[PDB]
Design a protein around this motif. Structure first.
Motif, mmCIF file in Angstrom:
data_model
loop_
_atom_site.group_PDB
_atom_site.id
_atom_site.type_symbol
_atom_site.label_atom_id
_atom_site.label_comp_id
_atom_site.label_asym_id
_atom_site.label_seq_id
_atom_site.Cartn_x
_atom_site.Cartn_y
_atom_site.Cartn_z
ATOM 1 N N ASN A 1 0.829 -1.168 0.057
ATOM 2 C CA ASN A 1 -0.027 -0.016 -0.209
ATOM 3 C C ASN A 1 0.849 1.217 -0.073
ATOM 4 O O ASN A 1 0.487 2.378 -0.327
ATOM 5 C CB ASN A 1 -1.084 -0.044 1.144
ATOM 6 N N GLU B 1 -4.789 2.336 -3.719
ATOM 7 C CA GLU B 1 -5.360 3.922 -3.874
ATOM 8 C C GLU B 1 -6.816 3.793 -4.604
ATOM 9 O O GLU B 1 -6.850 2.988 -5.350
ATOM 10 C CB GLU B 1 -4.499 4.552 -4.744
ATOM 11 N N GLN C 1 -4.311 -0.900 8.393
ATOM 12 C CA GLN C 1 -2.998 -1.303 8.302
ATOM 13 C C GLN C 1 -2.591 -1.288 6.984
ATOM 14 O O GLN C 1 -1.539 -0.554 6.228
ATOM 15 C CB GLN C 1 -2.379 -2.662 9.129
ATOM 16 N N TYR C 2 -3.514 -1.949 6.124
ATOM 17 C CA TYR C 2 -3.079 -2.319 4.555
ATOM 18 C C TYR C 2 -3.640 -1.242 3.723
ATOM 19 O O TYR C 2 -3.603 -1.278 2.395
ATOM 20 C CB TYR C 2 -3.278 -3.701 4.220
ATOM 21 N N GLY C 3 -4.320 -0.114 4.483
ATOM 22 C CA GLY C 3 -5.242 1.020 3.710
ATOM 23 C C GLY C 3 -4.456 2.187 3.536
ATOM 24 O O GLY C 3 -4.811 2.979 2.826
ATOM 25 N N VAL C 4 -3.455 2.343 4.532
ATOM 26 C CA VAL C 4 -2.947 3.764 4.792
ATOM 27 C C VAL C 4 -2.387 4.180 3.207
ATOM 28 O O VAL C 4 -1.611 3.483 2.756
ATOM 29 C CB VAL C 4 -1.726 3.694 5.746
ATOM 30 N N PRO C 5 -2.825 5.285 2.730
ATOM 31 C CA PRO C 5 -2.672 5.689 1.254
ATOM 32 C C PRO C 5 -1.199 6.112 1.235
ATOM 33 O O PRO C 5 -0.495 6.365 2.121
ATOM 34 C CB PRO C 5 -3.437 6.680 1.106
ATOM 35 N N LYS C 6 -0.715 5.981 0.007
ATOM 36 C CA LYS C 6 0.660 6.378 -0.404
ATOM 37 C C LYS C 6 0.763 7.958 0.077
ATOM 38 O O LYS C 6 -0.074 8.629 -0.395
ATOM 39 C CB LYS C 6 0.998 6.272 -2.007
#
Ligand SMILES: CCCCCCCCCCCCCCCCCC(=O)OC[C@H](COP(=O)([O-])OCC(O)COP(=O)([O-])OC[C@@H](COC(=O)CCCCCCCCCCCCCCCCC)OC(=O)CCCCCCCCCCCCCCCCC)OC(=O)CCCCCCCCCCCCCCCCC
Ligand SMILES: CCCCCCCCCCCCCCCCCC(=O)OC[C@H](COP(=O)([O-])OCC(O)COP(=O)([O-])OC[C@@H](COC(=O)CCCCCCCCCCCCCCCCC)OC(=O)CCCCCCCCCCCCCCCCC)OC(=O)CCCCCCCCCCCCCCCCC
Ligand SMILES: CCCCCCCCCCCCCCCCCC(=O)OC[C@H](COP(=O)([O-])OCC(O)COP(=O)([O-])OC[C@@H](COC(=O)CCCCCCCCCCCCCCCCC)OC(=O)CCCCCCCCCCCCCCCCC)OC(=O)CCCCCCCCCCCCCCCCC
Ligand SMILES: CC(C)=CCC/C(C)=C/CC/C(C)=C\CC/C(C)=C/CC/C(C)=C/CC/C(C)=C/CC/C(C)=C/CC/C(C)=C/CC/C(C)=C/CC1=C(C)C(=O)c2ccccc2C1=O
Ligand SMILES: CCCCCCCCCCCCCCCC(=O)O[C@H](COC(=O)CCCCCCC[C@@H](C)CCCCCCCCC)COP(=O)(O)O[C@H]1[C@H](O)[C@H](O)[C@@H](O)[C@@H](O)[C@@H]1O
Ligand code: HEM
Ligand code: HEM
Ligand SMILES: CCCCCCCCCCCCCCCC(=O)OC[C@H](C)OC(=O)CCCCCCCC[C@@H](C)CCCCCCCC
Ligand SMILES: CCCCCCCCCCCCCC(=O)O[C@H](COC(=O)CCCCCCCCCCC)COP(=O)(O)O
Ligand SMILES: CCCCCCCCCCCCCC(=O)O[C@H](COC(=O)CCCCCCCCCCC)COP(=O)(O)O
Ligand SMILES: CCCCCCCCCCCCC
Ligand code: FES
Lengths: 126, 102, 22, 534, 143
Positions: D481, D487, E135-140
C-alpha cells in the motif's frame, strides 16, 4: 562479500558503515564493575531493614554472574551423536513427494501388487 | 508504654518532661518541616525526601538522605502550670553547612 | 563518617515528676 | 498604489537581490523538522502573556491583611506578592485565563525543547558543522528550566516556598563558600527582603534577554547552514530538497504557529493549573505531602531522594549528603553539553555531515539516548514517588529502593533491548532490498509448495530472485500500500459518484503527474552519480 | 466442512435434552440433601449453551449447501487441484502487541479505579484497533 568497518562486521550489524556500531568489550565491563561497586555501596546507608539488602545482594550476584560469562566467554561443542533412525551429517534427503508423484528413486521399484494398492495399474508405466 | 523504651542521647537525659519530648521540626537534611508523626510506628517522616527519624531513639534517622538526628529541646513546667522551655538546643538547627561541627 | 558526636544513653533512667505547689 | 510603494522602498535600501535570496531559500519538509517551531511559538506566548501579567503583580514580601475577591482568606495575613497573585485570578477580568495560559505555555516550552533536543540527538544533527547550535540549545534548555523555576516561585504560596527553602538549604550546604554564596544571593538568612525582588527582576529581564539573545543567534545560525535532511531520492550532501520560503513555508509556519497558540488557549480555560488559592501563604512551619516542584524540576528532586546518607565529617567541618547530588547533576549537565565532542572522539569521524541518519543506523548512540532517557524518567518518577506510592498502592520505601537500584539496572536493560531492536530494524530493511516486498498472496504451486509472492523494487536476473539493491540510508517500503496499490480509484464526494468524463481525465492527469515526478527524481539521482565521479 | 456442520447437532440435541431434564428434575424433586425449586443458573446457561452449538451448526449447514466439491473435501484428490491462490495473509504487524498493551492500560485503570486512566485506556484501545484494520489501507504519502 561482508565488509568490516571499525571491528564490526556488516554480517552481524548490516549498517556498520553508517553510524557508531559496537562498544569495545572492555567498556562494557568497566560500566558493569562500576555498577557492582555502586550496588555494594548501597549497603552503607541508615536503613534498619534487611529485605532491601537481600535484593541488593541478589542483583549484585546476577550482575557478577553476567560479567563473568561475558569475560571468559564460555563455549561448548556440537554433540555429534546418532539417534534411532536419524542419519549422520552428510546425508542427502530424497525428495519423497517427487518420488511419490513420479515413480522414481524410493518409489522406483514397486511390485505390480503394490502398484494396484496405490490405485495405479502396472500397464500404465513403462 | 512507649516512653519507657526510649533511648536517650548522652547529655540530654533531662530534656523531657514526664512523657513529653520536643524535637526541632526542621529536617536535618534540608530545611523541610518533618511533621508526619506516625502514632504507632513512632517514626517522623519528612514529606520532601522521605527521611524517617525515630522518636524512641532521640530522633536518629532510619531511612532517607538525612544523616544527623533531630535536635531536642529541653522543656519543663513552671509554677503556674504552663509548659515552658527549660533551656536551649545544644546544637545548630536545620540543614548542615561547611562550618557546622565541633 | 558514621556519626559526628551523637552517642547512645549513658545509663537507663526512671523518675516521678510529682511537680506540686499545693 | 502597490507598484509605487515597492519602487520608493527599493530605491533607498537596494533590497531587490537581498529579499529575493530570502524568499527562495529551500527548507526540507519533514514532520520532525517542525518540533523546533513549537518551542518558538510557546516562547512567544510566554513573553506576551508574561507582560500582561506584570501590570497587576506586586513582587513584595511585605505582609498585609487580605481583603479582596477571594472571600476565603479574607483576614489572613499574607505577603504582597501572594495577595496580588491572588487578585489577578479573582479580581481581574480574564486574569485566571491568562495566568493559566502562562503556566501551560511554560510546560509546553520545556517539552517543546526536550523533544526537539531528542530529534537533534537521534538523527545526528549536532555533527560538523553544527556544534555551536548544540551548545546554544543546551544552554537554552537549562536556562528555560531555571526561568520556569523562578516563575512559579513568584506567587510566594506554601507549595513554592518549600521549593525555595530546599534551594536555599542546598546552596548553604556547599563546601567552603556555600555559606557566603547563599548570603550573597538571598542577601541574608532565608527568607529575606529583596529575595522576591532579585528573582522577579531576573525572571522578567535577565533570563528573557539572555534567552531571546540565544534564540535569535540560534535561528540566524540555522538560517546560515540552511538546515539538514534525511537521505532520499535525488538528494545529496551539497543540496537541499524541499519547498521555498514563499508561498509554501511561510504560510505553513503561520498556520502551525496559530495552531499552537489556539491549543494553549484551550488548555488555559478547560484545565486547571497551579491552584494557588488552595495552598495558602508561605509559612516555614507548615508543609504538604505532595511538595514536588514542577515536571521539569522533578529530576533534581528525584536525585535528592535516591542519594543515601553519605555525610563526610572532617573534624570541625562537614560535607552534607546533598553535595553528592549537586556533583551528580553537574556530571549529567557536563555529559549533555559536551556530547558532540565525546561522540566524535570514540568514533573518530568529523567530516562535515549535512545528511541526517536514521536512529536505527546508529545503534550505540540510539541506545545511549534511550539509556539516558530511562535515567531521566526514573529520576522524574522518583521526584514524585510519594504521589506514585499512594495512588498506585506501592510501599514508599520500595519506591525509594526501586529508584536507587533502577538507576543502575534500568539503563542497562534499556541499552541491551534498544541495541538489539535497532539491529532488528536494520535486518528487516535488508530483507526487502534483497527479496522484495512481502505481498500477502500465498499461492500454491502445482507440486503443492506454498509460496509467498514477492514484489521486487529492482531488476531481476533470470527467474525472480531480484538483484539485491544496496542500502541507501533512506526508508524502504515494507507494504504494498506504500506503493499506492490500494489507492482509491473512485473520484467524487461521500454521496456524489462524480461524472466519468471528468473522472477519467483526473486519474490520467495524476498518473502523468507522478510519472513525471519519479522521472525528475531519478534524473536528479543520475546527476549526482556522474558529478561524484569527477 | 461437510461433516463439521453435522457433528454440532450431536452436542446441540444432547445439551437441549439435558437442559429440559435439568429444569424439570430440579423443580419437582425433593432429595433431602437439597431444597426444591428450579435452579436459574444451570438452566439459563445450559439452554443458551446449546444455543451456541445450534447457531454455529446451522450457519455452517447453510454455508455448506452452496459450496462445490472442494479438493480438501474430496477423497481422491490430486495435489494439483488446489493449484492457485490461497488469498491474503498478513506477513507482519506491530499492532497486536500495541493493542495488548492498550488493554493492559485499561485493565490497570479499572483495577486502581482511576477515571482518567479508564478513559485514556478506552481511547488508547479504539486507536490501536482502528490502526490494525487500516494497516493495509494507509494511502501512499501525498505531498
Ligand atoms: C517586505 C520587507 C520589508 C522590510 C521590513 C523587514 C524588516 C527586516 C528586513 C529583513 C529582510 C532582509 C534580510 C537580509 O539579510 O537582507 C539584507 C538586505 C540587503 O541584502 P544584500 O543586498 O545581499 O546586502 C549585502 C549584505 O547583507 C550587506 O551587509 P553589510 O556589510 O553592508 O552590513 C549590513 C548589516 C548591518 O551591519 C551589521 O550589523 C553587521 C555587523 C558588523 C559588525 C562589525 O545588515 C544589513 O544588511 C542591514 C539590513 C537590515 C537593517 C535593519 C532592519 C531594519 C528594520 C527596522 C525598521 C522598522 C522599524 O537589506 C534589506 O533588505 C534592507 C532592510 C529594509 C529595512 C526597511 C526599513 C523600514 C522601512 C519600512 C517603511 C514601510 C513603508
Ligand atoms: C502513549 C504512547 C504514545 C507514543 C507515541 C509517540 C509518537 C511519536 C511519533 C511517531 O510515531 O513518529 C513516527 C516514527 C517514524 O518516523 P518517520 O518519519 O516515519 O521515520 C523517519 C526515519 O526513518 C527515522 O525512523 P527510524 O526507522 O530510524 O526509527 C526511529 C525509532 C528508532 O528505532 C529503534 O531502534 C527503536 C528502539 C527504541 C525502543 C525501545 C524501548 C526500550 C524500552 C525501555 C525498557 C526500560 C526497562 O525511534 C527512535 O529514534 C527511538 C527514540 C525514542 C525511544 C524512547 C522509547 C521510550 C523508552 C522510555 C521507557 C520508559 O515512528 C516511530 O518509529 C516511533 C518512535 C518515536 C518515539 C516513540 C518512542 C517509542 C515507544 C516505545 C515505548 C512504548 C510506549 C508506551
Ligand atoms: C507489551 C506491550 C508492547 C507495546 C509495544 C508496542 C508499541 C509499538 C509502538 C508503535 C510505533 C512503532 C511503529 O510504528 O512501528 C515501528 C517503527 C518501524 O517500523 P516501520 O517500518 O516504520 O513501520 C511502522 C509504521 O511506520 C507505523 O505506522 P504509522 O505510520 O501509521 O503510525 C504512526 C504513528 C501514529 O501517529 C501518531 O502520531 C499517533 C498519535 C498517538 C495517538 C494516541 C491516541 C490516544 O504511530 C504511533 O505513534 C503509534 C504508537 C501508539 C502505541 C500505543 C500503545 C502503547 C501501549 C501503552 C502502554 C502504556 C504503558 C505506560 C508506562 C507505564 C510505566 C510505569 O519504528 C520503530 O521501530 C519504533 C519502535 C518502538 C518500540 C517498539 C518495541 C517495544 C519493546 C518494549 C519492550 C517491552
Ligand atoms: C564547558 C564545561 C562545563 C566543561 C566541563 C569541564 C569542567 C571544568 C566541569 C566542572 C567539573 C565537574 C565535572 C563537575 C562539577 C560538580 C560540582 C561541584 C557542581 C556544583 C555547582 C553548583 C554551585 C551547583 C548549584 C546547586 C544545584 C544545581 C542544585 C540543584 C537544585 C536546584 C538549583 C533547585 O532549584 C531545586 C529546587 C527544588 C528541588 C531541588 C532542587 C535542586 O536540586
Ligand atoms: C517499564 C518497566 C518497569 C518495570 C519495573 C518493575 C520492577 C519493580 C520491582 C518492584 C519490587 C517491589 C517488591 C517489594 C519489596 C518490599 O516491599 O521491600 C521494601 C524494599 O524494596 C526493595 O528493596 C525492592 C527494590 C528492588 C527492585 C529492583 C527494581 C529494578 C527494576 C527496574 C529492574 C527489574 C525489572 C526489569 C523489567 C523491565 C522489562 C524489560 C526486561 C521494604 O519493605 P518495607 O517498605 O520497609 O515494609 C515492610 C514492613 O511493612 C514490615 O513490617 C516488614 O516486617 C518489613 O520487613 C518491611 O519489608
Ligand atoms: C529554545 C528552544 C529552541 C528553539 C525555539 C529552537 C528552534 C529551532 C529551529 C526553529 C530550528 C530550525 C530547524 C528545525 O525546526 O528543526 C532549530 C534547529 C536546530 N536546533 Fe533548535 N531550538 C531550540 C532548542 C534546541 C536545543 C535544546 C538544541 C540542542 C541541544 C537545539 C539544536 C538545534 C540543532 C542542531 C538544529 C539544527 C537542525 C538542523 O539544522 O538540521 N535546539 N532549532
Ligand atoms: C521565558 C519564559 C518563561 C517561563 C518558562 C515562565 C514561567 C513562569 C511560570 C511557570 C510562572 C508561574 C505562573 C503561575 O503561577 O501559574 C510564571 C509567572 C510569572 N511570569 Fe513568567 N515565564 C516566562 C517568561 C516571563 C516573562 C518574559 C515575563 C515578563 C515580561 C514573565 C512574567 C511573569 C509574571 C509577572 C509572573 C507572575 C506570577 C504569577 O502571576 O503567577 N514571565 N512564569
Ligand atoms: C570510581 C567509581 C566508584 C563508585 C562509587 C561508589 C562508592 C559508594 C561508597 C560510598 C560509601 O558507602 O561510603 C560512605 C562514606 C562514609 O561517605 C562518603 O564519603 C560518600 C562517598 C562519596 C560517594 C559519592 C558518589 C556520588 C555519585 C555520583 C557523582 C555518580 C553518578 C554518576
Ligand atoms: C537527551 C539525552 C541525550 C544525551 C545522551 C547521553 C550521552 C552522554 C553519555 C556519554 C557516554 C559515553 C559512552 C562511551 O563513549 O562509551 C565508552 C566510555 O567509557 C565508558 O564506558 C564509561 C564507563 C562509565 C560507566 C558509568 C556507570 C554508571 C553507574 C551508575 C551511577 C549511579 C567508550 O566507548 P568505546 O571505548 O569506543 O567502546
Ligand atoms: C513525563 C513524566 C511525568 C512525571 C510524573 C511522575 C510520575 C507520578 C505520576 C502520578 C500519577 C497520579 C495519577 C492519579 O493519581 O490519578 C488521578 C490524579 O491525577 C490525575 O487526575 C492524573 C491526570 C494526568 C493526565 C491525564 C489526562 C487524561 C486526559 C487525556 C486527554 C488527551 C486520580 O484519579 P482520578 O482523577 O480521580 O480519576
Ligand atoms: C515597471 C517599473 C516599476 C516596478 C518595478 C518593481 C519595483 C521594485 C520592487 C522591489 C521589491 C522589494 C520588496
Ligand atoms: S528535607 Fe527532610 S528528608 Fe530531604
Amino acid at each position: 562479500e561482508p565488509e568490516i568497518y571499525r571491528g564490526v562486521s556488516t554480517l552481524d550489524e548490516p549498517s556498520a558503515a553508517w553510524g557508531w556500531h559496537g562498544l569495545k568489550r572492555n567498556t562494557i565491563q568497566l560500566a558493569g564493575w562500576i555498577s557492582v561497586l555502586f550496588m555494594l555501596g548501597y549497603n552503607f546507608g541508615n536503613h534498619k531493614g534487611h529485605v532491601e539488602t537481600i535484593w541488593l545482594l541478589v542483583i549484585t550476584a546476577l550482575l557478577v554472574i553476567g560479567l563473568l560469562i561475558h569475560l571468559f566467554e564460555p563455549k561448548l561443542s556440537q554433540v555429534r551423536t546418532i539417534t534411532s533412525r536419524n542419519k549422520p551429517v552428510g546425508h542427502v534427503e530424497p525428495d519423497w513427494t517427487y518420488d511419490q508423484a513420479t515413480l522414481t528413486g524410493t518409489w522406483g521399484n514397486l511390485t505390480d501388487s503394490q502398484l494396484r494398492s496405490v490405485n495405479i495399474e502396472p500397464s500404465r508405466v513403462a | 508504654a512507649d516512653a519507657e523504651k526510649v533511648i536517650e542521647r548522652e547529655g540530654q537525659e533531662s530534656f523531657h518532661y514526664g512523657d513529653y519530648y520536643a524535637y526541632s521540626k526542621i529536617c536535618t537534611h534540608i530545611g523541610c518541616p518533618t511533621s508526619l508523626y506516625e502514632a504507632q510506628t513512632n517514626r517522623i517522616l519528612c514529606p520532601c525526601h522521605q527521611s524517617q527519624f525515630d522518636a524512641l531513639h532521640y530522633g536518629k534517622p532510619v531511612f532517607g538522605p538525612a544523616a544527623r538526628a533531630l535536635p531536642q529541646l529541653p522543656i519543663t513546667v513552671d509554677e503556674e502550670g504552663y509548659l515552658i522551655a527549660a533551656g536551649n538546643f545544644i546544637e545548630p538547627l536545620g540543614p548542615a553547612f561547611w562550618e557546622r561541627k565541633s | 563518617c558514621x556519626x559526628x558526636x551523637x552517642x547512645x544513653x549513658x545509663x537507663x533512667x526512671x523518675x516521678x515528676x510529682x511537680x506540686x505547689x499545693x | 498604489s502597490l507598484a509605487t510603494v515597492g519602487n520608493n522602498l527599493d530605491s533607498r535600501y537596494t533590497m531587490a537581490s537581498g529579499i529575493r535570496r530570502q524568499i527562495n531559500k529551500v527548507f526540507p519538509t519533514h514532520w520532525s523538522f517542525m518540533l523546533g517551531e513549537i518551542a518558538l511559538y510557546s516562547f512567544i506566548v510566554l513573553l506576551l502573556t508574561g507582560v500582561y501579567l506584570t501590570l497587576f503583580f506586586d513582587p513584595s514580601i511585605t505582609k498585609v491583611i487580605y481583603d479582596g475577591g477571594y472571600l476565603p482568606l479574607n483576614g489572613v495575613e499574607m505577603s504582597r506578592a501572594y495577595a496580588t497573585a491572588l487578585d489577578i485570578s479573582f479580581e481581574v477580568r480574564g486574569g485566571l485565563f491568562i495566568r493559566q495560559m502562562h503556566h501551560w505555555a511554560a510546560l509546553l516550552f520545556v517539552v517543546s525543547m526536550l523533544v526537539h533536543m531528542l530529534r537533534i540527538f537521534f538523527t545526528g544533527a549536532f555533527r560538523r558543522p553544527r556544534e555551536a547550535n548544540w551548545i546554544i540549545g543546551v544552554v537554552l534548555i537549562i536556562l528555560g528550566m531555571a526561568e520556569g523555576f523562578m516563575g512559579y516561585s513568584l506567587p510566594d504560596d506554601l507549595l513554592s516556598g518549600v521549593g525555595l527553602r530546599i534551594m536555599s538549604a542546598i546552596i548553604v550546604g556547599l563546601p567552603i563558600i556555600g555559606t557566603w554564596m547563599h548570603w550573597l544571593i538571598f542577601g541574608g538568612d532565608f527568607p529575606s527582603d529583596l529575595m522576591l525582588d532579585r528573582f522577579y527582576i531576573a525572571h522578567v529581564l535577565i533570563i528573557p534577554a539572555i534567552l531571546l539573545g540565544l534564540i535569535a543567534a540560534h535561528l540566524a545560525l540555522v538560517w546560515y547552514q540552511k538546515h539538514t535532511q534525511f537521505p532520499g531520492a535525488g538528494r545529496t550532501e551539497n543540496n537541499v530538497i524541499g519547498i521555498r520560503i514563499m508561498p509554501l513555508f511561510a504560510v505553513k509556519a503561520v498556520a502551525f504557529g496559530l495552531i499552537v497558540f489556539g491549543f494553549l488557549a484551550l488548555l488555559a480555560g478547560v484545565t486547571t493549573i497551579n491552584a494557588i488559592w488552595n495552598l495558602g501563604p508561605y509559612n516555614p512551619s507548615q508543609v504538604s505531602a505532595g511538595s514536588q516542584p514542577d515536571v521539569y524540576m522533578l529530576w533534581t528532586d528525584g536525585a535528592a531522594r535516591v542519594m543515601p546518607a553519605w555525610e563526610l565529617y572532617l573534624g570541625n567541618y562537614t560535607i552534607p549528603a546533598v553535595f553528592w547530588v549537586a556533583v551528580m547533576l553537574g556530571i549529567l549537565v557536563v555529559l549533555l553539553v559536551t556530547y558532540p565532542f565525546i561522540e566524535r572522539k570514540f568514533t573518530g569521524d568529523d567530516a562535515h555531515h549535512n545528511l541526517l541518519q536514521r536512529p536505527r543506523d546508529v545503534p550505540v548512540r540510539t541506545s545511549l539516548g534511550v539509556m539516558a532517557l530511562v535515567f531521566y524518567i526514573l529520576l522524574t518518577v522518583s521526584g514524585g514517588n510519594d504521589v506514585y506510592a499512594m495512588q498506585f498502592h506501592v510501599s514508599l520505601n520500595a519506591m525509594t529502593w526501586i529508584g536507587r537500584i533502577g538507576l543502575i539496572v534500568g539503563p542497562a536493560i534499556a541499552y541491551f533491548i534498544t541495541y538489539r531492536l535497532c539491529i532488528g530494524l536494520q535486518r528487516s530493511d535488508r530483507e526487502v532490498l534483497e527479496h522484495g516486498i512481502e505481498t500477502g498472496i500465498i499461492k500454491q504451486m502445482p507440486n503443492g509448495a506454498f509460496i509467498e509472492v514477492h514484489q521486487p523494487l529492482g531488476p531481476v536476473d533470470d527467474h525472480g530472485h531480484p538483484i539485491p539493491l544496496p542500502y541507501a540510508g533512506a526508508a524502504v517500503p515494507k507494504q504494498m500500500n506504500q506503493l499506492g496499490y490500494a489507492e482509491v480509484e473512485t473520484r467524487g464526494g461521500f454521496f456524489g459518484p462524480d461524472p466519468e468524463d471528468i473522472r477519467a481525465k483526473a486519474k490520467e492527469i495524476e498518473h502523468a503527474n507522478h510519472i513525471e515526478e519519479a522521472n525528475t527524481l531519478r534524473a536528479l539521482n543520475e546527476a549526482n552519480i556522474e558529478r561524484d565521479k569527477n | 466442512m461437510k461433516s463439521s456442520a453435522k457433528l454440532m447437532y450431536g452436542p446441540t440435541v444432547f445439551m437441549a435434552a439435558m437442559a429440559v431434564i435439568y429444569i424439570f428434575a430440579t423443580m419437582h424433586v425433593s432429595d433431602g440433601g437439597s431444597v426444591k425449586g428450579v435452579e436459574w443458573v444451570g438452566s439459563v446457561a445450559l439452554v443458551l449453551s446449546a444455543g451456541l452449538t445450534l447457531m454455529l451448526g446451522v450457519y455452517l449447514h447453510f454455508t455448506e449447501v452452496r459450496v462445490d466439491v472442494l479438493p480438501e473435501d474430496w477423497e481422491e484428490a490430486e495435489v494439483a487441484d488446489k493449484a492457485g491462490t490461497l488469498g491474503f495473509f498478513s506477513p507482519s504487524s506491530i499492532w497486536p502487541a500495541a493493542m495488548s498493551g492498550a488493554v493492559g492500560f485499561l485493565a490497570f485503570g479499572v483495577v486502581y479505579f482511576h477515571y482518567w486512566m479508564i478513559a485514556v485506556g478506552l481511547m488508547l484501545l479504539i486507536f490501536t484497533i482502528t490502526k490494525l484494520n487500516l494497516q493495509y489501507g494507509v494511502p501512499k504519502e501525498k505531498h
